[PDB]
């Protein structure tokens, strides 16, 4: 099955939107960016659901409060995607979205000490790898009962690049160039 990677926390915590939900994601975006949203009139608390404007693209997203910060700021998660950001204004979540689960689901790649011993290098290499397929991946489940479920990811393009094995190879190659 096909999905798009929308956020990487680490190799064991990856947010993906599975293709079955592409139209649903489009409708959420269209509805949030198509009508006037209502600013909140009092402070929110951790875990409150709301909507924020994302500074990077100026568009609107379903959000959940992660932290109540000083200076009336909030760290929030964009629940449909997984990335976090800091905003100074919150909007009410329109009622029609209340029961709709977050679009993105969390999965994990297989474990590797290479990834754990070299976190920053692994993540920057992974980012470049994902950019090379614009985040579009084929997904096979290794362990569905795990939390997050463990998966194998392949670039959804002509290379069919095997990400778990390839990422290990690239990281080891850079470490070897520097250290040997």
UniProtKB/Swiss-Prot annotation:
It is found in: Cytoplasm; Cytoplasm, Perinuclear region; Cytoplasm, Cytoplasmic ribonucleoprotein granule. Residues 43-102 form the Tudor domain. Transmembrane segments: none annotated. The TUD mRNA accumulates within the posterior region of the developing oocyte during the early to middle stages of oogenesis. May act via the Piwi-interacting RNA (piRNA) metabolic process mediated by aub and AGO3 Piwi proteins, which mediates the repression of transposable elements during meiosis by forming complexes composed of piRNAs and Piwi proteins and governs the methylation and subsequent repression of transposons. Required during oogenesis for the formation of primordial germ cells and for normal abdominal segmentation. Not involved in repression of retroelements. May form part of a piRNA processing complex consisting of tud, aub and AGO3. Interacts with AGO3 (when symmetrically dimethylated on Arg residues) and aub (when symmetrically dimethylated on Arg residues). Interacts with vls. Interacts with me31B/DDX6 (when symmetrically dimethylated on Arg residues). This is Protein tudor. It comes from Drosophila melanogaster (Fruit fly). The chain holds residues 1981 to 2160 of 2515 of the full protein.
